[PDB]
Write an enzyme that holds these catalytic residues in place. Sequence first.
Site, PDB file in Angstrom:
ATOM      1  N   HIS A   1      35.012   8.087  41.837  1.00  0.00           N
ATOM      2  CA  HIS A   1      34.330   8.223  40.553  1.00  0.00           C
ATOM      3  C   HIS A   1      33.891   6.864  40.013  1.00  0.00           C
ATOM      4  CE1 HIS A   1      33.219   9.480  36.599  1.00  0.00           C
ATOM      5  NE2 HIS A   1      34.217   8.837  36.020  1.00  0.00           N
TER       6      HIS A   1
ATOM      7  N   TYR B   1      34.894  13.822  24.234  1.00  0.00           N
ATOM      8  CA  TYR B   1      35.176  15.138  24.786  1.00  0.00           C
ATOM      9  C   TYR B   1      35.120  16.207  23.701  1.00  0.00           C
ATOM     10  CZ  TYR B   1      36.990  12.793  28.994  1.00  0.00           C
ATOM     11  OH  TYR B   1      37.127  12.078  30.160  1.00  0.00           O
TER      12      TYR B   1
ATOM     13  N   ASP C   1      29.069   8.510  34.140  1.00  0.00           N
ATOM     14  CA  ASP C   1      30.073   9.310  33.442  1.00  0.00           C
ATOM     15  C   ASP C   1      29.499   9.909  32.162  1.00  0.00           C
ATOM     16  OD1 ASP C   1      33.559   8.732  33.604  1.00  0.00           O
ATOM     17  OD2 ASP C   1      32.563  10.288  32.409  1.00  0.00           O
TER      18      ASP C   1
HETATM   19  C1  LIG Z   1      28.117  23.607  29.375  1.00  0.00           C
HETATM   20  C2  LIG Z   1      28.160  22.154  28.829  1.00  0.00           C
HETATM   21  C3  LIG Z   1      28.648  21.120  29.894  1.00  0.00           C
HETATM   22  C4  LIG Z   1      28.694  19.645  29.346  1.00  0.00           C
HETATM   23  C5  LIG Z   1      29.195  18.629  30.430  1.00  0.00           C
HETATM   24  C6  LIG Z   1      29.252  17.154  29.921  1.00  0.00           C
HETATM   25  C7  LIG Z   1      29.763  16.138  31.033  1.00  0.00           C
HETATM   26  C8  LIG Z   1      31.327  15.947  31.097  1.00  0.00           C
HETATM   27  C9  LIG Z   1      31.771  14.646  31.830  1.00  0.00           C
HETATM   28  C10 LIG Z   1      33.289  14.434  31.729  1.00  0.00           C
HETATM   29  N1  LIG Z   1      33.714  13.189  32.454  1.00  0.00           N
HETATM   30  C11 LIG Z   1      35.010  12.768  32.554  1.00  0.00           C
HETATM   31  O1  LIG Z   1      35.845  13.501  31.983  1.00  0.00           O
HETATM   32  N2  LIG Z   1      35.521  11.674  33.206  1.00  0.00           N
HETATM   33  C12 LIG Z   1      36.954  11.176  33.395  1.00  0.00           C
HETATM   34  C13 LIG Z   1      37.842  12.223  34.199  1.00  0.00           C
HETATM   35  C14 LIG Z   1      39.321  11.672  34.418  1.00  0.00           C
HETATM   36  C15 LIG Z   1      39.350  10.267  35.166  1.00  0.00           C
HETATM   37  C16 LIG Z   1      38.323   9.210  34.565  1.00  0.00           C
HETATM   38  C17 LIG Z   1      36.892   9.843  34.247  1.00  0.00           C
END
Ligand SMILES: CCCCCCCCCCNC(=O)NC1CCCCC1
Lengths: 487, 541
Positions: free
Chosen positions: A466, A408, A276
């Site tokens: 997941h 986030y 994750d």
């Molecule tokens: C262009 C830049 C992109 C950056 C990406 C970074 C990775 C993001 C990962 C996000 N992961 C999650 O939000 N996981 C949660 C989603 C909702 C259920 C539990 C797990």
Amino acid sequence: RVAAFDLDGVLALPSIGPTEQLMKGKITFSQWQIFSQAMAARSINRPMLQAAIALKKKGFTTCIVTNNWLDDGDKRDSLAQMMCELSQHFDFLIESCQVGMIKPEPQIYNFLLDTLKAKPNEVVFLDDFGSNLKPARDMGMVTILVHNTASALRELEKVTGTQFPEAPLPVPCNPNDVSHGYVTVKPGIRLHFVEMGSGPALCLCHGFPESWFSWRYQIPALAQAGFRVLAIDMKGYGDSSSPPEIEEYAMELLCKEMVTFLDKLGIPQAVFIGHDWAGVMVWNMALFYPERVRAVASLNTPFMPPDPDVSPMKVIRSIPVFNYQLYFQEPGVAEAELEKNMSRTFKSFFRASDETGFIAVHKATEIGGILVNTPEDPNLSKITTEEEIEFYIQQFKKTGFRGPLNWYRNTERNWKWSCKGLGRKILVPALMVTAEKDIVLRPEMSKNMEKWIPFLKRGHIEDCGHWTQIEKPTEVNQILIKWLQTE
Amino acid sequence: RVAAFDLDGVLALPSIAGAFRRSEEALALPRDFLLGAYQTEFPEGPTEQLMKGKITFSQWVPLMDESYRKSSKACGANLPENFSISQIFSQAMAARSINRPMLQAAIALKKKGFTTCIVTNNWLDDGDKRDSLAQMMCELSQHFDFLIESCQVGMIKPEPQIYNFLLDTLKAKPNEVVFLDDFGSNLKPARDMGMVTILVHNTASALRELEKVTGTQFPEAPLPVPCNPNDVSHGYVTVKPGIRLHFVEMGSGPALCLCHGFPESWFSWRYQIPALAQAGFRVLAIDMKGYGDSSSPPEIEEYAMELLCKEMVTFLDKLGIPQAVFIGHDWAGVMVWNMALFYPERVRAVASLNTPFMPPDPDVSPMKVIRSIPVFNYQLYFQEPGVAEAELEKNMSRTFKSFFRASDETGFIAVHKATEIGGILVNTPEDPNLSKITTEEEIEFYIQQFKKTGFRGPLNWYRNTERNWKWSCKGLGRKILVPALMVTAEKDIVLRPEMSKNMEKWIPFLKRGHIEDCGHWTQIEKPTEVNQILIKWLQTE
Ligand SMILES: CCCCCCCCCCNC(=O)NC1CCCCC1
Ligand SMILES: CCCCCCCCCCNC(=O)NC1CCCCC1
């Protein structure tokens, strides 16, 4: 009730006077060869060890009453590991060479029930001899022989009590039954973790919204796989500092601190296995600090470098399966929803690849929240036990939810940072493990990862959601082990 | 006031640059050929994306390789066609180690109250042997406040913008800051800004000389790397319900737990821990049951050696460690030997300081042997619960500066008189003098520690004589057949060396170590040696 097990060949196989004193303990090993090697060839009798945790969990008192001996051999280490492994799954150790008396001298037996605080009847012994089991049933004990490598054994063992599965799960290490390290990397911030086994080191970083406890199935096995594991509580979660500032979670920092945490701990290098959000960090660790990363492995999370001419935010406003994510953006909001009732919040998040009550990853803004759908009283997923959930609850009750979410909320900065490692690539051992039925973080999002990570080895698991570590644990282990094993 | 140094040639030697040099001549290469890719105000091509941290190392080879091949046969001497620079820059980087005296020079000011740091032209090594760098880097880690890596901040030396970035964070002016480099062409900017320049040429001394001239003076045989204060990891294993054992951790395996004695704490090994770690080991300076942050019950039985050893074992299982090196001192040392004696499997090896292996006499009441030996009175004094305690607790300050004194120092304890004059600190001064072996602060820790634990618990170690005797009597027919080390102190009043002499009757192959002018507090009195002896020991096994 209680369960007793010999060792000579009941929890280790291949199986196997004056030196009758070697048993008693007046004499050591190096006291008296063409035999030594034999004690090293035998390993744990897993299904039997299973049969044990079984009862242990079922509310019994497990134990081992063996005709021990003190090993000061050149290869005693083995015994240690086995011993240090069985250790955790029994309440008492009646080693012959420790209490003077040895099987089948009735005084040993009386010594057990004595410490066990039980009647010969409500206690069952297990031996591969029978000459040693005579006393047991004579006393009124429920005796059970072995002869073979189990089965028939565990069978007439099922009868007395319950049933055991043919294909079990890896033992779920836990709970407090573990060591709890606490490194303070910066003033107000200290990172708690967990430790197991002897080096080399490999830190296991969790994701959102989880805790070190997530690796509860990998940790032990990984340790027993010949490694010193560090199931860390990611900044913001559980027992580690969880500041309220957002900047505090810029990936740039998390990685830096991750590094500090190493220095502080005196470890000059480690294997970083992330999942994750962690996984993201893990890849950046590999990308920004090669020296300190022995190797890297990621679950679900692929290496997605940032587009230099594409606002990072826009790429989110785009991808439809990232709405909820967007929902999280606004501070206090997301929090308020998940905190309102942690019970649901969790049984909700944690569900199998093939299960109902899913999260609202894309309709978030609109329906008002990542949980606006889903039942009120979710059903316990066949992937977490009430208790398993309660830990997560207690954990979060103390940390809150802001901190984790702040992971986030660092999009621009993250983008601006990862943009520096665009001209280079990951040239240290890497592993990318893809989940199949992973809604968000879909496998196909890796495909061109090699453009950046050549030699990148991969692993893929089917019917996996997941929550990989908790859904397909045994496999995750295998894959991971075999990986480290071959490097 | 801060002080910084360009690692390669100041903290690390032999300057990597040297390797290029000795490699140029090797292949009849005109002075500074491949050298440009390092020492040149011509920061260009690949070598400039390297220190700039735009591209890793592994990439910098195929690219630099060819950028060299540029002037290969073109404008310059013959440069082997297939000729690379991979495994040649790699060795030079590995063959280099820390500049001990210079590191010394740093901790000096650090202690003195300065803001140390390093401003180097870094590169991200994703090499087959990048580990080396990690260690050396993991070490220097604690001794500096700031690390300005060229390959981390975008700018590289000697481009002004880097320097202006350092003072920015150091929040200082060019005058109250000094820069150390082995080039000078890198030092030019510094002076011009207003900094104190210094050509870290030669190798040391000469540099630390012109240096001394603007700071202070440095030890000739400095005091080994000490692992404190709170800058460490703190493990916490719970072995039995109410009892949990706190400890400390450092470095990577194999594991060797350091158990302290009476009346001490893990903090005692403050000098061995780091070095031992850096010696390639995962140390576990444990707080012995009863002391410091570990559970310190009030029950006496709770401290039977039989138990302490058992739990010691549990503590391992719990921690998932299947084997360890046990180095004990004082009371611990006793346990350590019993560990070796009762649990061979779990002991990789054993080492003891002062404390010798004294099996019990089967036909000689253990107590009698105490009522006998004259230098064990105080010990006897301890027997009675509440008593001893009351004396040591009444004023921890004295109690400590009292106990802790050098082999050649006044205000000694009353090890044999005790009972008579009732007390050990009885005839000792009112306010003892600080022994040249512990700093007020060093003592204060011991105080705070004991303020929370009390003194009963530790003393209960003494009060288990019969039981101990009855137990150790079982391991009378066997012997210690695992690697062992017996380190004897010379001027150790009680626990005199000569009390070992026949230890071999029980421990053949037993290797030994002996230190002169050493009191009972070995780890704190003769630390550097203790380290050496210990290391070299583990090293050869
Ligand atoms: C262009 C830049 C992109 C950056 C990406 C970074 C990775 C993001 C990962 C996000 N992961 C999650 O939000 N996981 C949660 C989603 C909702 C259920 C539990 C797990
Ligand atoms: C069951 C038999 C036990 C025999 C005891 C052997 C020796 C034990 C070591 C005792 N050590 C100490 O008492 N150290 C103290 C002495 C007073 C000053 C500080 C250090």
